[PDB]
Structure formats: structure tokens, C-alpha cells
Design a protein around this motif. Sequence first.
Motif, PDB file in Angstrom:
ATOM      1  N   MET A  18       0.736  -1.079   0.186  1.00 40.07           N
ATOM      2  CA  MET A  18       0.619   0.229  -0.198  1.00 40.07           C
ATOM      3  C   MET A  18       0.699   0.805  -0.053  1.00 40.07           C
ATOM      4  O   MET A  18       0.397   2.418  -0.838  1.00 40.07           O
ATOM      5  N   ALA A  19       2.233   0.850   0.550  1.00 42.95           N
ATOM      6  CA  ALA A  19       2.922   2.653   0.841  1.00 42.95           C
ATOM      7  C   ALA A  19       3.614   2.539  -0.550  1.00 42.95           C
ATOM      8  O   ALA A  19       4.184   3.406  -0.454  1.00 42.95           O
ATOM      9  N   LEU A  20       4.111   2.334  -1.528  1.00 42.13           N
ATOM     10  CA  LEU A  20       4.803   1.826  -2.481  1.00 42.13           C
ATOM     11  C   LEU A  20       4.776   2.402  -3.021  1.00 42.13           C
ATOM     12  O   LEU A  20       5.681   3.018  -3.929  1.00 42.13           O
ATOM     13  N   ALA A  21       3.620   3.214  -3.784  1.00 41.96           N
ATOM     14  CA  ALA A  21       2.741   3.570  -4.308  1.00 41.96           C
ATOM     15  C   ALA A  21       2.974   5.602  -3.472  1.00 41.96           C
ATOM     16  O   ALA A  21       3.729   6.356  -4.491  1.00 41.96           O
ATOM     17  N   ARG A  22       3.460   5.382  -2.464  1.00 42.04           N
ATOM     18  CA  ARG A  22       3.777   6.945  -1.925  1.00 42.04           C
ATOM     19  C   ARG A  22       5.257   6.994  -1.432  1.00 42.04           C
ATOM     20  O   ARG A  22       5.651   7.416  -1.068  1.00 42.04           O
ATOM     21  N   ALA A  23       6.325   5.933  -1.765  1.00 39.16           N
ATOM     22  CA  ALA A  23       7.252   6.018  -1.503  1.00 39.16           C
ATOM     23  C   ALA A  23       8.447   6.476  -2.553  1.00 39.16           C
ATOM     24  O   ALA A  23       8.501   5.884  -3.694  1.00 39.16           O
ATOM     25  N   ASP A  24       9.746   7.003  -2.333  1.00 43.68           N
ATOM     26  CA  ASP A  24      11.013   7.844  -2.621  1.00 43.68           C
ATOM     27  C   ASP A  24      11.848   6.597  -2.551  1.00 43.68           C
ATOM     28  O   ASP A  24      13.047   7.346  -2.534  1.00 43.68           O
ATOM     29  N   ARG A  25      12.024   5.429  -1.025  1.00 43.55           N
ATOM     30  CA  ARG A  25      13.358   5.509  -0.383  1.00 43.55           C
ATOM     31  C   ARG A  25      12.507   4.263  -0.224  1.00 43.55           C
ATOM     32  O   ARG A  25      12.167   3.360   0.361  1.00 43.55           O
ATOM     33  N   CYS A  26      13.793   2.867   0.119  1.00 43.30           N
ATOM     34  CA  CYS A  26      13.362   1.420  -0.164  1.00 43.30           C
ATOM     35  C   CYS A  26      14.825   1.655   0.796  1.00 43.30           C
ATOM     36  O   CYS A  26      16.253   1.373   0.230  1.00 43.30           O
ATOM     37  N   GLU A  27      15.038   0.782   1.653  1.00 45.36           N
ATOM     38  CA  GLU A  27      16.508   0.295   2.685  1.00 45.36           C
ATOM     39  C   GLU A  27      16.181  -1.103   2.957  1.00 45.36           C
ATOM     40  O   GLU A  27      15.779  -1.948   3.383  1.00 45.36           O
ATOM     41  N   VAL A  28      17.156  -1.931   2.151  1.00 44.44           N
ATOM     42  CA  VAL A  28      16.283  -4.202   1.587  1.00 44.44           C
ATOM     43  C   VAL A  28      18.705  -4.212   2.437  1.00 44.44           C
ATOM     44  O   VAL A  28      18.886  -3.873   2.036  1.00 44.44           O
ATOM     45  N   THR A  29      17.473  -5.052   3.280  1.00 47.51           N
ATOM     46  CA  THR A  29      18.729  -5.990   3.557  1.00 47.51           C
ATOM     47  C   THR A  29      17.954  -7.488   2.976  1.00 47.51           C
ATOM     48  O   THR A  29      17.256  -8.028   3.189  1.00 47.51           O
ATOM     49  N   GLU A  30      19.532  -7.767   2.421  1.00 47.95           N
ATOM     50  CA  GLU A  30      19.087  -9.459   1.683  1.00 47.95           C
ATOM     51  C   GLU A  30      20.041 -10.502   2.272  1.00 47.95           C
ATOM     52  O   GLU A  30      21.074 -10.283   2.700  1.00 47.95           O
ATOM     53  N   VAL A  31      19.427 -11.157   2.793  1.00 46.41           N
ATOM     54  CA  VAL A  31      20.267 -12.690   4.020  1.00 46.41           C
ATOM     55  C   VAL A  31      19.868 -13.566   2.640  1.00 46.41           C
ATOM     56  O   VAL A  31      19.352 -14.508   2.148  1.00 46.41           O
ATOM     57  N   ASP A  32      21.264 -13.952   2.693  1.00 43.74           N
ATOM     58  CA  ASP A  32      21.363 -15.219   1.934  1.00 43.74           C
ATOM     59  C   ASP A  32      20.856 -16.314   2.563  1.00 43.74           C
ATOM     60  O   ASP A  32      21.837 -17.010   3.765  1.00 43.74           O
ATOM     61  N   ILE A  33      19.646 -16.853   1.997  1.00 37.57           N
ATOM     62  CA  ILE A  33      19.007 -18.223   3.700  1.00 37.57           C
ATOM     63  C   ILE A  33      18.114 -18.577   2.433  1.00 37.57           C
ATOM     64  O   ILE A  33      18.010 -18.130   1.744  1.00 37.57           O
ATOM     65  N   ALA A  34      18.499 -19.790   2.307  1.00 35.33           N
ATOM     66  CA  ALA A  34      17.359 -20.805   1.409  1.00 35.33           C
ATOM     67  C   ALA A  34      16.419 -21.041   2.417  1.00 35.33           C
ATOM     68  O   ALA A  34      16.376 -21.656   3.628  1.00 35.33           O
ATOM     69  N   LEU A  35      15.150 -20.948   1.894  1.00 34.50           N
ATOM     70  CA  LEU A  35      13.622 -20.715   2.234  1.00 34.50           C
ATOM     71  C   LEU A  35      12.999 -21.801   1.973  1.00 34.50           C
ATOM     72  O   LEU A  35      12.507 -21.393   0.620  1.00 34.50           O
ATOM     73  N   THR A  36      12.275 -22.239   2.063  1.00 35.62           N
ATOM     74  CA  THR A  36      11.323 -23.624   1.720  1.00 35.62           C
ATOM     75  C   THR A  36      10.111 -22.495   1.145  1.00 35.62           C
ATOM     76  O   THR A  36       9.323 -22.375   2.585  1.00 35.62           O
ATOM     77  N   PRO A  37       9.664 -22.885   0.429  1.00 32.90           N
ATOM     78  CA  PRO A  37       8.402 -21.496   0.398  1.00 32.90           C
ATOM     79  C   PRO A  37       7.223 -22.682   0.628  1.00 32.90           C
ATOM     80  O   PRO A  37       6.908 -23.443   0.691  1.00 32.90           O
TER      81      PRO A  37
END
Length: 156
Positions: free
Chosen positions: A100-119
Motif C-alpha cells: 500500500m505504501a510503495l506508491a507513495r515511497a521514494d526510498r527503500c532500504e533492503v537487507t538481503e539475507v543469503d538463506i535458503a527457505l522452503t516456500p
Amino acid sequence: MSMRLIWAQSTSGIIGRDNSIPWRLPEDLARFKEMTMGHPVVMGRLTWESLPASVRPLPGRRNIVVTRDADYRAEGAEVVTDLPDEPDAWVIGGAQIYAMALARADRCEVTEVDIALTPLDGDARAPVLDDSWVATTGEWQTSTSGLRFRFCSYRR
Ligand SMILES: CCc1nc(N)nc(N)c1OCCCOc1cccc(CCC(=O)O)c1
């Protein structure tokens, strides 16, 4: 206008299952605290209830809980039924709150973790950022916990 999104995801894009987080990554906690301190933080009810009790509410930040249940008691937080127009706020949880907020957003801060997860059914997935975002990709890093991770910043 200027909502900021911050999340941690696995490399497959999973941000959690029922708000439970499979990795222990203190460096991500440190960066989350640095980015959000002194600003409003906007979250869903499940994110709120999943905060460790000692930081519910998150200290030094105005906590805002978004839920369709108008009657809800969040001690130390402001309960609203719709995403608020707080200019300097950080959206911190809700796969649906990010959407819902993505449309109003001008910044994203992401941490990507190298971890395998079963969907698993009903996984929360990170937003897919389109080509309007300018990506700044941090170097791959190793945690005190042994996990590989990296920080990425997106702006437009
Ligand atoms: C930190 C996980 C995270 N990591 C990223 N990168 N984005 C998120 N939205 C995100 O979840 C925020 C909800 C859980 O919050 C916590 C949970 C535990 C401890 C703390 C630090 C306390 C402080 O900050 O004082 C905060």
C-alpha cells in the motif's frame, strides 16, 4: 510523498512467515535502528504484536499501527485505520503495508539475507521494485552469526 520502506528478505524474497524470522542477523537490527530512530514507524497489527516486548513500542520513534479493526489497543502506539500521511515516516512491516505504501515511497532500504527457505503457503514476499528505482548495492558481507548478507538502497 516521502514514505520510506525498510525490510529484510531472503534472497528468494521472503520477508517472513507469520511474522517469524528464520535468521539471526544483529547487523540488520543495528541498521534498522540507525535508519528509523527519531522518526515515525508505520506497521501492521501482526508486526506490532511480534515486536520483542522490551521494544514494544519501538523507543524513540512514534509507533503507528494500521489495522481495519478500529477498536484496537496498542499501548504506546497510535492506532489508525488507514495508512497515514506522515512525511518522514518509515514503513516497517506488513507485506500488505509495503504494497500500500510503495506508491507513495521514494526510498527503500533492503537487507538481503543469503538463506535458503522452503516456500510455504501464505509467505510474505518483498515488493518487486521496477525500473524507476535507482539501486545502490552494498558489498556482500558476513555476519557475526556466520550468515552472508548485504544492504541495498533504492531511491527515486
Ligand atoms: C529488525 C528487523 C527488520 N529489519 C529490517 N531491515 N526492516 C524491518 N522492517 C525489520 O522489522 C522491524 C520489525 C521488528 O523490529 C525489531 C525487532 C527486534 C529488534 C529491533 C531493534 C530495536 C530498535 O530498533 O531499537 C527491532
